[PDB]
Sequence to fold (458 residues):
Amino acid sequence: HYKTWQRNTAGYLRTFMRNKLPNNEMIGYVINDKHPKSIRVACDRFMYVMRYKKTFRYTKKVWAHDEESEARLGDVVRIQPLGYRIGPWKNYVLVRVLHKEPR
Amino acid sequence: LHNSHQARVLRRRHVYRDKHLDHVPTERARQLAEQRSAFEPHLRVKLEKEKFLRDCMREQENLAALFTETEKETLLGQTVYDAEKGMFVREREGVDPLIKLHELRQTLLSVSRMMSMNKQGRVYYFRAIVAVGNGRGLFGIGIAFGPSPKEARSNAALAAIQNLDHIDFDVGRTLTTPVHGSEYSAHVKIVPRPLGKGLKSNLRYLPLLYLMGIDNCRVSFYGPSASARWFTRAKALKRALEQLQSRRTLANATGQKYDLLVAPGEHWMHWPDRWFRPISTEYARMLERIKKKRPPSYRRGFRAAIDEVIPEEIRPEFTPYTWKSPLQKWAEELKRKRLTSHNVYETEVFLHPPA
RNA sequence: AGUCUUAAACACACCGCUCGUCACGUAACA
RNA sequence: GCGAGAAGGGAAGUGUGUUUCAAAG
RNA sequence: UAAUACAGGGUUGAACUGUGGGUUAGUUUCAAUGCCCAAGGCAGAGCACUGGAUUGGAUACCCAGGGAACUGUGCUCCCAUUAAUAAGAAUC
RNA sequence: GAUUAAGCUGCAUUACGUUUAAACUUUACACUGGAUACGUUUUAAUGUUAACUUACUA
RNA sequence: ACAGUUACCGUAGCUGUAGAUGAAUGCUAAUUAUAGAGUAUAUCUCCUAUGACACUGCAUAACAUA
RNA sequence: UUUUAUGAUCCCAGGCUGGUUUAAUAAGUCAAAGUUUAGCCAGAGUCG
RNA sequence: UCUUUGCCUGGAGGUUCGUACAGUUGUAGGUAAAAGGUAUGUUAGAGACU
RNA sequence: AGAGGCUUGAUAGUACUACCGUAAGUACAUAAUAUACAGUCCCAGCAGUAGCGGUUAAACUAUAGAAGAGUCGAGUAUUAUCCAUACAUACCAGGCGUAAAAAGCGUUCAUCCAU
RNA sequence: AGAUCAUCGAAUAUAACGG
RNA sequence: UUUUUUUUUUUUUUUUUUUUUUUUUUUUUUU
RNA sequence: GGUACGAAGUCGAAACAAGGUAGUUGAUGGUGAACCAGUGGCUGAACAAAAA
Fold:
């Protein structure tokens, strides 16, 4: 939790903007594409510390869904959240693929 | 910043970063360009010009200033009055007589005691640290030793006078930035104060502040020493604290930019041309420049009628007019007569009745 | 015997300084 | 016919809460 | 630490390459002396051990004998822990 | 015999332990339930007791 | 925010002193009648009361036209 | 096939937030890593 | 002047694959000075000389 | 003293929001002191890291010891509690020669850093 | 509906699925 | 125990690199 | 068994400075008490110490 005066500093606002995306979108790279029509997207987030005034990074691995199964391992993609639960692990939907690794 | 795996697979502009193919202006690159222009005009150097007439034809002139026999043949052949006290005082005693001793102040810091061992017993000698400096623009610290506390104080003060150093203080009594100071554990942070507020410091050290000539400041000692005594390290903190101060006149000379205060307007930078506009003009040569200069056809100055002003006594306040009220005329008449009196008005009387 | 050089955990400065076993008494981790 | 736990600390750690948005039974 | 065989490192010359890097666990080799085990022996040395000295009241100081310990592809890093008390970049 | 099967997660008295652990009102300005109505009414409200560990006060 | 710790000099570590008063205790004062804010404050044992009488409405067809 | 030092398996205890003035050229424009007092959200079921 | 690894908080102290593996500075009875050092003095069966 | 609790050996700068030398309880009445003195004498005690007490030190007891020299006041003071005042709880704002602190020497994983 | 450091008690770590 | 002579066995740092010579090129305020 | 504090008695002369014939340390052996013998490492090492 952040105090009222902690929500107006440039350090916190800058971190917020980086994390914040349209439709709560995220950026990550796929690390597992073994199961059919399934890909695990590894997203990286950021956080601010009001004590030492330094920002660190922590990975957030999540599961996604692909229709055409165009994405492959080691390919940065875009994910979008959803207001339901489908499958045991599936919690995201693909939109597009930015980069493609050769084979 | 944040050179993560994801950032490294997106910031690469190209598969190869050919740095050797970069175009950077080097020294040899420009040298070759100039040489290529010269068709088959090279680097050349010049030696110093040594002329004998520079000093041969000038040294003789300096001789005329000392050719007199009374200034060349010779080479190549204790009290001061103090009128309000009226007592003899040692003048020189290893002290510059030119410097006035009736304008400085001293402040006793501490009187430490030491111990010395000898073949028989122990020997003790006292010491003191006395800081002497004018309270306008001067400061100094002296240290010495003596057999007794009274003698130690006098000896310590002697060194302070001989080691007087100038400071860089603002004319306006307003520092620029707060200075900080260190020697081992110590920290002496001087917090400036607004103009017209006065000094604010420890009462014990209050006199010290005054002696420094610093106005509108908050001097605080942040743990002068965390071990042993705290008087010796403290001595050197002052020295390397006031040297860092800078005034307007200093920064402006090198900064060549607007460095003015808030109250005054362009006091140090404004330099009216007092040798071009107010140039003298005589009536014998004025007629010649009338037919050569541009004729006067302009309208931008109304208050342009003044000459040599002669001191004259006037009384604008006591000036009867046709529009003043009857009461004002009466009131001014009595007041005017009181100031012109030279028998009662310009006198001092102790008792009320003429006793 | 009087100086010089070096060392020092002493500076009431070698009648200095300082350690260990055993004997008696008071206590906390039992 | 209508109102009434207006005296509740027993459960839970990645939860309870906070923040950003949305909601024409 | 002369000769010979195997394979490293450093200095200089040419070619090639065209940002290849600094630090480093849930990691991996080596590492004086001592001890267990094992292999051992016929030299030079010596802890323990009755083998010739003590005192101004107690001793290993000064000789000699003396079956442990001294070459390991092993078990193995406790220390005063192997070329200063920083592994890198910039100012000469 | 006809359905004859009663005492709290609440409140109060007494007692033990701990350096310390709360009972005195014409309880009627409000909020709120009910209702056709400022037509009714209710301790969760309000006002007083206090070893002052605070404001104000010729 | 400053002093003290052999009567020389870096570290390190102590005593008094500031504010916040959301416990207890000692001494002395009930001294006009315009005296206050917060979980209204914690653990355990015995006994008694509650539970059919709780607020409101007969507009719950009432008191009913010279 | 899946998690795993960016703490996977796993034992005990703690429920989250707001509260206006507030001195000092630390003159805060929100009291500056973390301090509270009327308050918000939230707190399973049972007459067999 | 800048990047990253590791480590310490005055001095000081502990019961009388299962006898295995892993792991360890810290919950005291007590204390107010341990200690680096420039200089002086003193001691020295420690070196030299009027 | 309309009225009580503290201190009476040294040490401590005794609080800060307006004013910031731009002015009187200014003078007479109206000027004094407590490092004078009394009791015990390593015994009885006080106190704060440092301490005092033997022959009498403003340090122990005592104020008809004198209309107590001082700070608060209808309260005062002791203990206790916390982010315990720059003992910096160390980005602001402390270290790794001798003093408490750099792993015996080296190649690699992740993170951070780089032109 | 999305995002949203964990801390103390000194410490002792690889576990669950299919051939 | 000394001297002399003629072939056994264990073991392998005495001789052999140097005025610390780069802007001297680096070690920590004060006593 | 071992450790803390107070008082203080006996038995010894280990550290200081080359007298204990240098002295701390890693792993062993031994001895009523200073601790002692051997190997490795260090200086926190004293004395002595070159021409043709």
About this structure: Residues 1-4, 17, 19, 187, 196-198, 202-204, 206, 222-223, 226 of chain B lie near RNA strand J (CB under 10 Å from a C1'). Chain B touches chain A through six residues (CB under 8 Å).
